[PDB]
Design a protein around this ligand. Sequence first.
Ligand code: CLA
Ligand code: CLA
Ligand SMILES: CCCCCC(=O)OC\C(C=C=C1C(C)(C)C[C@H](OC(C)=O)C[C@@]1(C)O)=C/C=C/C(C)=C/C=C/C=C(C)/C=C/C=C(\C)C(=O)C[C@@]12O[C@]1(C)C[C@@H](O)CC2(C)C
Ligand code: KC2
Ligand SMILES: CC1=C(C#C/C(C)=C/C=C/C(C)=C/C=C/C=C(C)/C=C/C=C(C)/C=C/[C@@]23O[C@]2(C)C[C@@H](O)CC3(C)C)C(C)(C)C[C@H](O)C1
Ligand SMILES: CC1=C(C#C/C(C)=C/C=C/C(C)=C/C=C/C=C(C)/C=C/C=C(C)/C=C/[C@@]23O[C@]2(C)C[C@@H](O)CC3(C)C)C(C)(C)C[C@H](O)C1
Ligand SMILES: CC1=C(C#C/C(C)=C/C=C/C(C)=C/C=C/C=C(C)/C=C/C=C(C)/C=C/[C@@]23O[C@]2(C)C[C@@H](O)CC3(C)C)C(C)(C)C[C@H](O)C1
Ligand SMILES: CC1=C(C#C/C(C)=C/C=C/C(C)=C/C=C/C=C(C)/C=C/C=C(C)/C=C/[C@@]23O[C@]2(C)C[C@@H](O)CC3(C)C)C(C)(C)C[C@H](O)C1
Ligand SMILES: CC1=C(/C=C/C(C)=C/C=C/C(C)=C/C=C/C=C(C)/C=C/C=C(C)/C=C/C2=C(C)CCCC2(C)C)C(C)(C)CCC1
Lengths: 31, 148, 143, 144, 155, 189
Amino acid sequence: ASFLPSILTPVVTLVFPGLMFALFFVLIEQE
Amino acid sequence: AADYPWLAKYGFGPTVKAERWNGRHAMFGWLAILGTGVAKSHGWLPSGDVALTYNEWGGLAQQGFNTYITNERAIIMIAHVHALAVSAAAAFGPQVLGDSLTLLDGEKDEDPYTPAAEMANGRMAMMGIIAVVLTSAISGKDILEVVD
Amino acid sequence: SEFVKPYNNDPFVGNLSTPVTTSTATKLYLGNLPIYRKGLSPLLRGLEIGMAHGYFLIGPFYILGPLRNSPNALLVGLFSAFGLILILTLGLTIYGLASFQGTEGGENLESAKGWRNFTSGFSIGAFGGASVAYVLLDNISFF
Amino acid sequence: LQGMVGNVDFDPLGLSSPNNIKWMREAELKHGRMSMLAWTGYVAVDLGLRFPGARYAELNSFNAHDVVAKKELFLLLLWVGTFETIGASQIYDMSIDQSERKPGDFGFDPLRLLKSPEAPKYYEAELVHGRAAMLAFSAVVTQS
Amino acid sequence: NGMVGDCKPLGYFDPLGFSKDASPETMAKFREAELKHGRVAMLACAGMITADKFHPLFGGKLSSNPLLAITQVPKLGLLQILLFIGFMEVFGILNSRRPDYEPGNFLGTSQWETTPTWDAYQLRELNNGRLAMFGAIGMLTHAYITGKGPLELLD
Amino acid sequence: PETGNKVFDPVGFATLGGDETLAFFRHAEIKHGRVAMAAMVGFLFHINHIHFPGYLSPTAGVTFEQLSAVGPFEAWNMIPLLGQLQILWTIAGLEHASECLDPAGHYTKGGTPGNLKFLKNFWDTPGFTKKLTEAQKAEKLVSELKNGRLAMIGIASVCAATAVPGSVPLLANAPALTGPGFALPFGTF
Ligand code: CLA
Ligand code: CLA
Ligand SMILES: CCCCCC(=O)OC\C(C=C=C1C(C)(C)C[C@H](OC(C)=O)C[C@@]1(C)O)=C/C=C/C(C)=C/C=C/C=C(C)/C=C/C=C(\C)C(=O)C[C@@]12O[C@]1(C)C[C@@H](O)CC2(C)C
Ligand code: KC2
Ligand SMILES: CC1=C(C#C/C(C)=C/C=C/C(C)=C/C=C/C=C(C)/C=C/C=C(C)/C=C/[C@@]23O[C@]2(C)C[C@@H](O)CC3(C)C)C(C)(C)C[C@H](O)C1
Ligand SMILES: CC1=C(C#C/C(C)=C/C=C/C(C)=C/C=C/C=C(C)/C=C/C=C(C)/C=C/[C@@]23O[C@]2(C)C[C@@H](O)CC3(C)C)C(C)(C)C[C@H](O)C1
Ligand SMILES: CC1=C(C#C/C(C)=C/C=C/C(C)=C/C=C/C=C(C)/C=C/C=C(C)/C=C/[C@@]23O[C@]2(C)C[C@@H](O)CC3(C)C)C(C)(C)C[C@H](O)C1
Ligand SMILES: CC1=C(C#C/C(C)=C/C=C/C(C)=C/C=C/C=C(C)/C=C/C=C(C)/C=C/[C@@]23O[C@]2(C)C[C@@H](O)CC3(C)C)C(C)(C)C[C@H](O)C1
Ligand SMILES: CC1=C(/C=C/C(C)=C/C=C/C(C)=C/C=C/C=C(C)/C=C/C=C(C)/C=C/C2=C(C)CCCC2(C)C)C(C)(C)CCC1
């Protein structure tokens, strides 16, 4: 519904990619 | 579990600490549904289904898009965002001799099954939340009318 | 005279003992800053830095933000400050994870436990500072 | 637990034992002192002790907060907040770690009264009066 | 002795002999007070001279009278000035507490190879400070008497 | 002597603390007696209409004549705000210097309670006490304690006279003691 853009666009394009960048940085800085 | 050592280290995943925290949140959430239901029954939230405007809430209002964001929605949004702010403060900030969201290095996740009373009530509260959401979805009725 | 000499009597270290670098004013202020202050635990270092940064972070969002000319300008500024502080403490946590991988000493900013205490201090302090600046800016007519 | 002032061991419900007590006894002292000052101000204001001023003449405790919230109570907020900030600096540096401090000892003994032989008397009277003033202020605020 | 305040017109000027039969602690206190007065008086004299005829701040119409201008300044500005000066003064106190401590040297000159050029420029600082000390008091007195600023009094 | 050569304390306020507390109480007694004695002399100077000539504040146009005319305590409220700030500030610096500059240490922790002469020529500026010796000076300090307590009782008497009806005999009617009973610092606040 018209709810879902608001729920999904910021979750998927601020939170998830920020977490992915954090995870990738932490992983590449291992050992 | 073992394939995800990183999230397993800090209790993130199928862990007793995560179950405890989510049960606490489900308890508070059922409380919140009851509280906002009685709030709607009484007069606290703005009425009239008045939509937000760009002059007060800007592009987050979505004045002309669609989706009828209301002043009651904005106020409860402010409330839950304050909850999320206190959340980051309590989780990342100092554990005030309570519970850490993360496991921490020294601690090991409590053994899987008053604290046990909390976990039983939390499982019950999560089940209640899921049952209410389902009943709303199948019936087509509002959640507040369902609990009412 | 000569106010620029080798750093710590070492001509071959890549530094100079200028008035800016090695004056008593610079030494006093830096050594007394929380990150360098003697006796402060990592929790208090993080706490002081957090409140310090949280107090000022709200301001740019409040006045120059999109909803500056709106009745909820200061509320939006506080929320923006909370978001920015969330990003900053996430950065702190991932920095600690990446840098201080294998550590057991603790009680030291260059160790995992010390940096975690520092990050907790920063996070709580910055949230509180943003809220305190909100409270002051609501009642700025007092002064 | 045990080994502290006013230890009746009144603890049916579970709150602190091998943990939390550093925070709990100190918080009891803070709450108690707050209660003494709150109840004393309530009774004095209701009796008639008033500041000299036109605005303060009509106000009576319960009807006073809303009018005295923005100007004078904000200055009170500033002072209390400063003192509680240094208190927090002392407090968070103790309980989260294990550095040596006692609960509620902010070092505020400028008159050196604890040097008296009857110092355990004070380390007893303070807690008892805080508790009594707490039960008193609960009543005076819940009457209205 | 060991200081750089002596000059040509008056030599070593101490008629009443305060420094005579005095401790190095008291001598250092005297020189710290001297340099602080000189520096504050420089700031005061320059402030009155510039603000008399060029005061763009605060709407560009605050009174050119030095005594009226500070009263016209908002309370927050005065509080901020006091906070800034106190934050300099705590570092002054810490520099006094330091083991190595010349009276007015926040620069920590002792660690560098200084010479008569440095001594002469310290003397320049001190002499200008004395002149500004007299100047600031004169300016304030004339402001109270006539009500005009320095340059308007000269006008 | 008048009290019977004894501790005088019937309630136990003496030993609420220790020697440091007793030293603080004695210094506070001395300071209170000194301010009360000065206040009594000032009250007499006022209510006898003794004042300096001229304009106290030529800019705001408030005068010593007005201060004398209106009443003792009201005069403080009619001092200009910045003048009251100056008076309290000059007392502030003196109190702070009294706390600090004793070379021996604090009156509680090494110094003599009531001793202020470490601030040079603060006491006996013309030098009346220079001629005296220690044996005379102890006797004179006992006199100071007595007169300070007595002036304390006097200022407490006149304050009650000026605030609450006719409390004190021989002043329970004098219209000399009028105006407010207790001035506030800076006037209203
Ligand atoms: C690659 C195909 C594709 C693309 C380019 C987009 C693009 C978009 N979708 Mg999405 N969407 C897709 C497939 C796709 N969608 C599919 C198949 C579904 C399920 C039927 C949805 C369901 C959906 C909803 C319900 C909504 C959007 C919305 C949006 C917009 C905001 C981004 C967002 O959060 O969506 C992502 C939302 C998801 C729930 C995730 C969908 C997962 C897809 C299938 C992943 C495909 C990955 C791709 C092939 C390769 C990897 C990419 C990357 C890792 C490099 C944007 C225009 C929002 C909108 O309308 O904004 C105006 C919105 O509310 N989409
Ligand atoms: C209050 C500021 C002040 C202070 C603290 C000092 C301190 C010092 N000066 Mg002095 N000095 C000052 C102002 C001051 N000076 C001014 C304005 C001049 C210009 C005339 C000089 C000219 C001068 C010279 C030429 C020399 C010194 C030297 C010294 C040092 C050694 C002598 C001594 O013991 O002085 C102690 C000083 C005091 C204890 C200050 C007492 C002030 C009294 C109470 C006030 C007198 C002024 C009067 C009330 C009003 C004047 C008119 C008008 C402004 C109303 C010492 C560090 C000598 C030095 O450094 O040798 C190496 C040196 O050679 N000074
Ligand atoms: C208080 C400020 C000064 C502080 C600096 C200082 O140190 O002071 C020292 C000090 C005393 C002191 C001591 C302490 C320091 C306390 C402690 C020390 O002991 C220790 C340390 O141990 C020694 C001791 C006891 O002695 C006191 C100093 C007091 C001072 C210097 C007081 C000036 C008033 C001027 C007024 C009211 C002007 C009105 C002017 C007004 C209202 C005007 O209308 C001016 C005017 O232009 C206007 C606005 C408009 C125009 O049309 C023209 C006119 C002309 C009309
Ligand atoms: C001693 C020197 C000094 C320093 C080093 C310094 C540093 C900073 C910094 C940090 C770098 C910030 C962030 C900052 C901010 C503000 N300063 Mg400020 N300031 C100094 C002096 C004065 C004076 C004299 C005044 C003043 C003011 C303001 C106002 C305006 C508020 C307003 O619009 O009302 C704001 C926002 C004026 C004021 O408070 O006016 C009521 C005023 O008169 N400042 N100030
Ligand atoms: C099938 C199968 C399995 C199984 C199983 C079983 C029985 C699984 C059951 C799972 C089940 C039943 C899982 C529910 C979770 C619900 C949650 C976390 C909800 C939280 C919801 C929360 C925290 C919501 C909170 C709020 O919104 C509320 C309500 C009010 C609002 O104001 C705002 C807030 C945020 C306060 C295995 C073991 C998996 C593998 C095996 O091989 C086979
Ligand atoms: C005692 C001592 C020292 C000292 C000292 C002294 C005397 C220091 C004095 C410092 C001084 C006097 C510093 C003022 C700054 C003023 C500023 C920046 C003004 C900002 C002004 C701003 C931001 C705005 C002004 C406005 O008007 C504008 C433009 C538009 C109007 O609509 C209204 C507003 C308000 C918005 C030493 C020498 C340092 C060391 C020594 O050891 C010890
Ligand atoms: C020793 C002892 C005991 C005791 C005791 C007792 C009874 C103690 C009593 C203490 C008491 C009663 C202390 C009063 C102080 C009054 C002051 C400071 C007044 C200042 C007043 C001032 C500064 C007035 C100033 C002015 O009016 C002036 C001068 C002229 C006007 O133009 C301006 C104004 C209006 C400003 C016990 C109880 C027996 C036992 C215990 O165990 C130990
Ligand atoms: C309550 C009451 C009343 C009252 C009252 C009372 C009791 C009032 C009391 C007032 C009182 C008791 C006021 C003392 C002042 C003392 C001063 C100023 C002493 C200065 C002394 C000085 C300056 C001494 C100096 C030196 O000697 C020194 C120290 C040593 C020598 O080397 C040098 C010299 C010689 C210079 C009413 C109203 C009257 C009647 C009513 O019915 C009841
Ligand atoms: C050096 C210098 C400078 C600089 C300066 C600066 C940089 C400043 C800053 C300032 C600031 C920046 C300030 C600040 C302030 C702050 C505040 C005021 C805060 C507060 C806080 C609080 C109050 C908090 C609290 C809390 C809470 C609420 C919660 C819980 C926790 C806590 C407790 C933390 C200048 C160049 C100018 C000049 C020269 C010199």
